[PDB]
Structure formats: structure tokens, C-alpha cells
Design a protein around this ligand. Structure first.
Ligand code: GTP
Ligand code: CL
Ligand code: MG
Ligand code: MN
Ligand code: MN
Lengths: 505, 174, 293
């Protein structure tokens, strides 16, 4: 590095412990050597004398390359080299007939070393966070591999010999540039954890269904356009995440055959309708995430058999109404309907006794329906950026309500029943048309945060507000407060609280 | 907020079954965010300069593998640690049962009768899915004679920094 | 097709008087943000770039100066570009700047790179004008989409294993690059930690080691810290931004650290020039300076 400045050239001008450890290991005849985290740049050639070593740990060092003397350690079974500057490996490692695990994570390998392809005794190989761009056909020699992780590389395709590794249990090729998965992957019937996330896959091979023991399949953030029907044979899958793909439809028998499916994610896809099938397809999932899609209608009776479903996310969709059986979702706990074209909430919402978190922000709601107070277990209610005009008096029955958000709404006055929310700790009233606050606001002992900024008609605050001893954070920005002295207003929230407390009757 | 010089280094190792929330707790402690997605961990190391009880220290938290497939060098990483967090999920009985196995493994690798460690009960926010009660956790902690704490990695965090600070205090005491 | 049309509509204002806005529909900007977020998540958080490369400092919404920088250095894909952050706020045309940068990133993912700055945060945008501009010209949904896109931006880059590029500077907690590699995305910028120091720290000649920062967050570091970091990590130069410099560039720790600022006449109150550093295959860095008006 040099700098061509001022019409000239300028430049940025600014192992005894290892030897002792090697001598100690030789004297003690130890079968394990740990030289990790020692800032070693060049490994001493004297290590060749330690022929009895079976485990060598050189990770977290500055090794540019390993000396050829390492090949004399024929008894090595574990070789840890993660977090180094290795660019290649010596060919002398062929003598390591007993090597079973090789760790090469976080290195500077531009390609898999040729000597690694000859270490047929390896059962676990780590190649994460390297610069590898291709996998040679010599991978077939490593038939004994059971764990292969080559994620965080620049691999664009996998050789057809990957299907000859019948002993593979976990295959990690995530965060690569793969565009197609060879059909030979179905020959590795012992694979239980296959990771394909953050790739450029366009489709999955029809032989993926031969992985009867597969339990984890990562397909999020790809270019998949459809799911093959053979995936239904993988009944051992626990979660099916398809976030950020081009999938728009699913096989009818896919979700039904996934008896062990506990969660389903279809976010950031091209779905315009719910997957075709009966209610039985959702009978096993605990959570259903279908946000950022273009779904406009929820089918009637879709969740009739979904007794276990508790979380539903429909954020950022094209919903304009709700199904007539909306009140039958008695098992619902958290419901997210934010960023939709909903204009009203049906009166059947009173039947959601188990509901605890309800989000209805960024909608076209104008009034909360009567019967909303039946939600005894409701804890969080979000109504930010709506067209609400007034709040129903039934809101006083939300004893378990803890957080209430009403930012960016056309509310003018608050009901006098808001003082019964003894568990309320957060109250966001910013950007509203509040002329004044009710005197009952002072009974909220647990209220900790109150937001009142950007209210143009809030000319005065009730004296009962000082009774909130737990009130720590308050926003009063841009408020006129014409009924209070300007000095106290300019002093800050603490000055306003002190003035209210001193003048309190 | 400026750390002083010649700070002592504490090596903290987090152990437990797969999916209990070790990585989520570590990320919440360091990056102050909650990762909703699940990705099995082979080995991850984190470093932070923090002041505990008005004493600056360097915390080197090491995250191990909860899955048997990914637990290849777990014993080696545990051998180099100074303190251990035994994390189990209150929604998983198997994780709570494997606490005994993890404690025995720690004792065997350290070759000591007792060692600084803390039993951590994670995912306590999932009250509807909770299967292990607080009484069972304290009973397990009392038997092994180790501190007990309940944590929640999901926002808002619950005692995420408290567990690591208590482990550092236990290391200092012994 | 559509991306080329967007780029052409953004570049057609080149050569005209400053202040002329570019009217793009909300759907196009949303698509640009989504595709840019996908590409950002498709690449490592710690970039490993190769020369030749152009490195630029803060822009802060000065679109016409972004255009001047492109004219001086060559519009893509003629030359590779690396931006160190702070593309929005404190500018009248932040939307045009960010849209052009995202379009160039989408069209040339492997030759165009954008690093995350301290202003690429929801809290900072809500205060320093980007939220106001988005609300004035569009809805808050676009601002939230921009926040989601910003949360996935990479943090630091390394050029030819000798130059370390970041917005703010060094961190006391930074002891290895794997720590940067382990930062999860998407994420908001915390008030403390490795990410906060990497986005907020500033060098200071009056500090021996680490010291308090006048910004009220992160820390300041001296020349000895830079020298020790370079020696430990076997690097040669630290390239940074975040701080305004009169000449557009300024060396620190005996040319071991360089601060780059690319927006001339910053905020309309400074007479500083904008500089861009060009790196060739031989790592012979050179600075192209945009003279102030
Ligand atoms: N709701 C909730 N989920 C949690 C909590 N802690 C962890 N999780 C979830 O637990 C799952 C696994 O989290 P990880 O951090 O990967 O768990 P781990 O035990 O470190 O995983 P391994 O490294 O594979 O053993 C993810 O779905 C997390 O979001 C918590 O406090 N609350
Ligand atoms: Cl700034
Ligand atoms: Mg983990
Ligand atoms: Mn900045
Ligand atoms: Mn700036």
C-alpha cells in the first residue's frame, strides 16, 4: 500500500512459548496438544517428534500454511485449523490414515486442497467461511463423511458425485450461489439435516422425497417457484420455512402428510390465496406466518381443525374483510393483521377469549366494535396509524392490558373508563387530536411510558397525572400547553411533573 | 465507559441441549437483538469489555453445540473455559433431564469435584408451553448446589446480562 | 428493463441545475428496496473486495455531488465502487441518492458495494430529516421499507487483505474479523457494543489509548491503537469516513489511517472539498478531489 500524493509517493510507515509447550508435550508424552490462541505464524518443525499425538488444536492463530512435518503425525485423529490464514495444505497429510475430523472454518482457501480429497478416512469436514468456488469430482473418495459443512462460500454447482456419500447425515451448503440441486442427492437416504437457505435454487429435484429420515430442511431466501409433491414423503419434518421465495401454490397432499409439522412460514412469497386443501392441513402447526404476501381472502372454516394453532401473522397483505367464523378462533393467542385494507372488526371478536396480543396497525379502522372488552386475556393492543374517531367504553374491561398504542389517529377524547387499566404500562397517544386527558388517567399506577407529542389541541394536562409515581418517560413535544406557564413547559417533563405534584389538591 | 488496562479475562462457556436458546441468549447479551430463526451452532466466540461490580473485565463467551451431530470438539472447547452456563428450555423435558449429563461432563473434563456454573431456565415467556416448573428447576439447582436463574431471550430480555454477571461473580468468589 | 428505465430517469437530471427532483413511483422504490435487501442478505456482512476499487465517503443526500463523483470516477460498470455509509439525512435529495445507489447495487451486485453508516438507522433517520422527506414525498410505509433494507447492509469491508474499510473506526471489543462475521442480520444499531463502535468511533490525536467521544456514544482511539491493530491483523491501512475533513481526506497515525469525505460544501455551512480514493492493482492509492463551489 502506497499513496501518490503531493506529486510524490508516500507510504504508511509504522515463539519461545510454543517451543516450551512442544518440549513439555514431548516430555509428558501427551496424546493431546493445544496451541490455540497463541498468535502463531509459523509452526515449528520440531512438532514432527510428537508422533504419539492424536488430537492437534491450532485454531485461532495466524498460520499462513502448515509445514510438511505435520505429515509425520500419522496417529492424528482430530485436526483443528479454524480461524487461520491457510491458503493450502501440504501433500504430506496423506500419511494421516487415522484422521477423522478436519476443521477449516474461517480460512482463506480459494479451493478445497487436493490432499483433502485423498483423506478418505475423514468423517467430519468443516469448510465454512472460505473462498471455495467449486467442488471437484474427487469428493466421491470421501465416502465415509457423515458431516459436511461448506456454507458461506462461492460454490455455484455441486458435482453429481455428491450422491455417492451415502453415509452423510448433515449437509450444509447454505449461503452459496447454487442454482440447481443434483438429483443424486436422493441417494443419500441417511441425511437428516439438509440446509439450502440463502442460495439461488430455482427448483428442487423430485428425488428429495427419498430422504425419509430428513427432519430439517432450510429453503428460505431462494428462487424456488414450486414445491415438488415428493416432499410429502418426508413426514419427519418439524418446520417448513419458505420465506422469501417465488412459491405461489403448494401440493394438496403436502401439508396433510407433514404430521410432525409444528410451524409453517410462507412470508415474502407470491401467494394470493391460501393453500388449496382442507382444514386438516393446519391441524398440527403451532404458528402460521404468511406475511408480506398478496392474500386477499381467508377461507371460511380454514382453522376449524386447527386446535393447536396459536400464532397467526397476516401482516402486509391485501385483506379487506374477515371470515364469518372469525370468532371461532378460540385457540388463537397472538394475531397480527397489520398493514391491510380492513375497514371494520366484526362483533364475533368477543369469542377470542385466549387472545393476548392483537395488532391492527396501518389499517382503515374507524371505530372499535362493541364487545372488545370480552378479551380478558388481552395484553397488547396495537392501533397505530388508523382512522379511529372514538374509543368504546368497553375498553375498561381489559384488566390484563399492558401496552396500548394509538399513535396517528383521529381520537379527540379518551373514555373515563381508561383508569381501570391498572396493568397498563405503555400508552402511545402521539399525533392525535386530544383536546384534554380524563381525570381518571391518574389512577394508572403501573403506567411507565406516556407519549403525547404532536397533539395540537392538548392545551392542558390533568393534575392527577402527578400521581403516576412509576411514570419515567414522557413525550410532550410540539404540544401547545397554552394553559400552563411557558417556563415550566420549556423546562421539560420533570418540571411539568413537579408543577403538577406541588399544585395537586 | 473507557476500559482500563491489564483487564482480567474470563472464559465463559454456554452448554445445553439443541434449541434451548444458548445462541439467542448470547446474541441478546452481545448484539442486544433477538434472532427468531433457528440455526444449529458448531462453535462461536464473543468478546466484550464490561465493568462488573465496579471492576472492569474481559468476557470471552464461547457458544457450543447442543446437537450431537455438531458436537465434535465440544469437550475441547469446554476444557478451556472458566465458567459454565447450563441452559435448558422450560418447554422441553429432555433438555431439563440432560442437565445431569452436562454437569457430569463438565466435572469429568475439569476433573474437579465442583466448578463454577449456573443453571439457566430459558424461554420462560412461553408460559402456555412451559412444562418444567420453577420448583423443579430450583430442586435441580439445590441438588447440584449451583445458582438458579430464569431468563428469556425474546424481547424484552429477562436477566440476560444478569446470568453472565452472576457467573463472573461466582468465578471471582472461587 | 424496468431497472434500466429507473436508472435512466435518475441520470437524466445530470448537468441540470441542482434541486431538480426525480419523480419515481412508490412501487418502483419498494421493489428496489426489496431486491437490494435480498442482495445484501445474499452477501457476507464482512466484504472481501479486490482492486481496482473506488472508495467514497459520506454523501448525506447530496445527489448532484454523487453525480459529480460518478462523472469523475466513471459511471458503473466502468469502475468498481465502495461507499462507506451515510447516504441519507442532511440533504435535500436523500431519496434520489439512495434510489440510485440501490439501483446500481441491484444491476451490478459484484461490482457495486455499500457499507452501513451511523445514519442508516431508524432512530437517526427519524430525527435528521430522512423520515421527514419520506413523509413529505411518500407514506411512512416507504420509510419502514427503507429501514428494513438498511438493517441488512454490510458493516465492514477488507480490500486485498491490507486495507480495512469501515464507517466509524476501530472498537475495543474488536479482536478478530470473525467477530464481525458473527454479527447477525437484520439488526438495528445498538447504543453499545462492537457494531456501535464500528459505526460511531472517531480517531483523536490527543488520546493515548481509548477515550470518551464528544458525540456522546462509542469511544475515541489514538495512533497507538491503530498501529497495534494493524500489526495484529497484518493490515496496512484503515480507510474510514464519519468525520468532516477540509481537504476531503486526512491521514492519521502517520498515514496508517485515512478519513474520506465525499460531499463538498457539507450541509451548506462548510467549505470542505469532497475526495474519492482510487486503488489500483498495485495498491497505489490516489485521491480525486471535488473542488468546492
Ligand atoms: N420465544 C422464545 N424463543 C426463544 C427464546 N430463546 C430461544 N428461543 C428460540 O429457540 C430457538 C433456538 O435458539 P438457539 O439460540 O439457536 O438455540 P441453541 O440451544 O443455542 O441452539 P444449538 O446451537 O443448535 O444447540 C429459536 O427458535 C429461538 O428463537 C426465548 O427466550 N423466547
Ligand atoms: Cl454524523
Ligand atoms: Mg447455537
Ligand atoms: Mn456518520
Ligand atoms: Mn456523516
Amino acid at each position: 500500500v502506497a499513496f501518490s500524493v503531493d506529486n510524490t509517493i508516500k507510504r504508511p510507515n509504522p515463539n519461545a512459548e510454543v517451543i516450551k509447550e512442544l518440549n513439555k508435550c514431548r516430555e509428558e508424552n501427551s496424546m493431546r496438544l493445544d496451541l490455540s490462541k497463541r498468535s502463531i505464524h509459523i509452526l515449528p518443525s520440531s512438532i514432527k517428534e510428537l508422533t504419539q499425538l492424536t488430537e492437534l488444536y491450532l485454531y485461532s492463530n495466524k498460520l499462513q500454511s502448515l509445514p510438511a512435518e505435520v505429515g509425520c503425525l500419522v496417529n492424528l485423529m482430530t485436526l483443528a485449523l479454524s480461524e487461520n490464514s491457510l491458503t493450502s495444505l501440504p501433500d504430506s497429510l496423506d500419511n494421516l490414515k487415522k484422521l477423522r475430523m478436519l476443521d477449516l472454518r474461517h480460512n482463506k482457501l480459494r479451493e478445497i486442497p487436493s490432499v483433502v480429497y485423498r483423506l478418505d478416512s475423514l468423517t467430519t469436514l468443516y469448510l465454512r467461511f472460505n473462498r471455495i468456488t467449486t467442488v471437484e469430482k474427487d469428493i466421491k473418495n470421501l465416502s465415509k463423511l457423515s458431516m459436511l459443512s461448506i456454507r458461506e462460500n462461492k460454490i455455484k454447482q455441486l458435482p453429481a458425485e455428491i450422491g455417492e456419500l451415502c453415509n452423510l447425515i448433515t449437509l450444509d451448503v447454505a449461503h452459496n450461489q447454487l442454482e440447481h440441486l443434483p438429483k443424486e442427492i436422493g441417494n443419500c437416504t441417511q441425511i437428516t439435516n439438509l440446509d439450502l437457505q440463502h442460495n439461488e435454487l430455482l427448483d428442487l429435484p423430485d428425488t428429495i422425497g427419498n430422504l425419509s429420515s430428513l427432519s430439517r430442511l432450510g429453503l428460505r431466501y431462494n428462487r424456488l417457484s414450486a414445491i415438488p409433491r415428493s416432499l410429502a414423503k418426508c413426514s419427519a419434518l418439524e418446520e417448513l420455512n419458505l420465506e422469501n421465495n417465488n412459491i405461489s401454490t403448494l401440493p394438496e397432499s403436502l401439508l396433510s402428510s407433514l404430521v410432525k409439522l409444528n410451524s409453517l412460514t410462507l412470508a415474502r412469497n407470491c401467494f394470493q390465496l391460501y393453500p388449496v386443501g382442507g382444514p386438516s392441513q393446519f391441524s398440527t402447526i403451532y404458528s402460521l406466518n404468511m406475511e408480506h404476501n398478496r392474500i386477499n381472502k381467508i377461507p371460511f372454516g380454514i382453522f376449524s381443525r386447527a386446535k393447536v394453532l396459536s400464532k397467526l401473522n397476516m401482516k402486509d397483505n391485501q385483506l379487506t374483510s374477515l371470515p364469518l367464523d372469525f370468532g371461532t378462533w378460540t385457540s388463537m393467542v397472538e394475531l397480527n393483521l397489520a398493514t391491510n385494507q380492513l375497514t371494520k372488526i366484526p362483533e364475533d371478536v368477543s369469542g377470542l377469549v385466549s387472545l393476548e396480543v392483537l395488532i391492527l396497525s396501518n389499517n382503515l379502522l374507524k371505530k372499535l366494535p362493541h364487545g372488545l372488552g370480552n378479551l380478558r386475556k388481552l395484553r397488547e393492543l396495537d392501533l397505530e396509524e388508523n382512522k379511529l374517531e372514538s374509543l368504546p367504553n368497553e375498553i375498561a374491561y381489559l384488566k390484563d392490558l399492558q401496552k396500548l398504542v394509538l399513535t396517528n389517529n383521529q381520537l379527540t377524547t379518551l373514555p373515563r373508563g381508561i383508569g381501570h387499566l391498572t396493568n397498563l404500562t405503555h400508552l402511545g397517544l402521539g399525533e392525535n387530536l386530544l383536546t384534554h386527558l380524563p381525570e381518571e388517567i391518574g389512577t394508572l399506577e403501573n403506567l411507565e411510558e406516556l407519549y403525547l407529542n404532536d397533539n395540537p389541541n392538548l392545551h392542558s394536562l390533568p393534575f392527577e397525572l402527578a400521581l403516576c409515581s412509576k411514570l419515567s418517560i414522557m413525550s410532550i413535544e410540539n404540544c401547545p400547553l397554552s394553559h400552563l406557564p411557558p417556563q415550566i413547559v420549556a423546562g421539560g417533563p420533570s418540571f411539568i411533573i413537579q408543577f403538577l405534584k406541588m399544585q395537586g389538591p | 465507559a473507557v476500559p482500563s488496562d491489564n483487564l482480567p479475562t474470563y472464559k465463559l462457556v454456554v452448554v445445553g441441549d439443541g434449541g434451548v436458546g444458548k445462541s439467542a441468549l448470547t446474541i441478546q447479551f452481545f448484539q442486544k437483538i433477538f434472532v427468531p430463526d433457528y440455526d444449529p451452532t458448531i462453535e462461536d466466540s464473543y468478546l466484550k469489555h464490561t465493568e462488573i461490580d465496579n471492576q472492569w473485565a474481559i468476557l470471552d463467551v464461547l457458544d457450543t453445540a447442543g446437537l450431537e451431530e455438531f458436537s465434535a470438539m465440544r469437550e475441547q472447547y469446554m476444557r478451556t473455559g472458566d465458567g459454565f452456563l447450563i441452559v435448558y428450555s422450560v418447554t422441553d423435558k429432555a433438555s431439563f433431564e440432560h442437565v445431569d449429563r452436562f454437569h457430569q461432563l463438565i466435572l469429568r473434563v475439569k476433573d474437579r469435584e465442583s466448578f463454577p456454573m449456573i443453571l439457566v431456565a430459558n424461554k420462560v415467556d412461553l408460559m402456555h408451553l412451559r412444562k418444567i416448573t420453577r420448583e423443579q428447576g430450583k430442586e435441580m439447582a439445590t441438588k447440584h448446589n449451583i445458582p438458579y436463574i430464569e431468563t428469556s431471550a425474546k424481547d424484552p430480555p429477562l436477566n440476560v446480562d444478569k446470568a453472565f454477571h452472576d457467573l463472573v461473580r461466582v468465578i471471582r468468589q472461587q | 428493463l424496468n431497472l434500466d428505465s429507473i436508472i435512466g430517469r435518475l441520470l437524466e437530471v445530470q448537468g441540470s441545475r441542482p434541486g431538480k427532483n426525480v419523480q419515481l413511483t412508490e412501487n418502483e422504490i419498494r421493489g428496489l428496496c426489496l431486491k437490494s435487501r435480498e442482495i445484501f442478505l445474499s452477501q457476507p456482512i464482512l466484504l472481501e473486495l479486490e482492486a481496482p476499487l473506488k472508495i467514497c465517503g459520506d454523501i448525506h443526500g447530496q445527489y448532484y455531488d454523487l453525480l459529480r463523483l460518478f462523472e469523475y470516477g466513471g459511471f458503473p460498470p466502468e469502475s468498481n465502487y465502495l461507499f462507506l455509509g451515510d447516504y441519507v439525512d442532511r440533504g435535500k435529495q436523500s431519496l434520489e441518492t439512495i434510489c440510485l445507489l440501490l439501483a446500481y447495487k441491484i444491476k451490478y451486485p459484484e461490482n457495486f458495494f455499500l457499507l452501513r453508516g451511523n445514519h442508516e438507522c431508524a432512530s437517526i433517520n427519524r430525527i435528521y430529516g430522512f423520515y421527514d422527506e419520506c413523509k413529505r414525498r411518500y407514506n411512512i410505509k416507504l420509510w419502514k421499507t427503507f429501514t428494513d433494507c438498511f438493517n441488512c447492509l454490510p458493516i465492514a469491508a477488507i480490500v486485498d487483505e491490507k486495507i480495512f474499510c469501515c464507517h466509524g473506526g476501530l472498537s475495543p471489543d474488536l479482536q478478530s474479523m470473525e467477530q464481525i462475521r458473527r454479527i447477525m442480520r437484520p439488526t438495528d444499531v445498538p447504543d453499545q457494543g462492537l457494531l456501535c463502535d464500528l459505526l460511531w468511533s472517531d480517531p483523536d490525536k490527543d488520546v493515548q489509548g481509548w477515550g470518551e467521544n464528544d458525540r456522546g456514544v462509542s469511544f475515541t482511539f489514538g495512533a497507538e491503537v491503530v498501529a497495534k491493530f494493524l500489526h495484529k491483523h497484518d493490515l496496512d491501512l484503515i480507510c474510514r469516513a464519519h468525520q468532516v475533513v477540509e481537504d476531503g481526506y486526512e491521514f492519521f497515525a502517520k498515514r496508517q489511517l485515512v478519513t474520506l469525505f465525499s460531499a463538498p460544501n457539507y450541509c451548506g455551512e462548510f467549505d470542505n472539498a469532497g475526495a474519492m480514493m482510487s486503488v489500483d492493482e498495485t495498491l497505489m492509492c490516489s485521491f480525486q478531489i471535488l473542488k468546492p463551489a
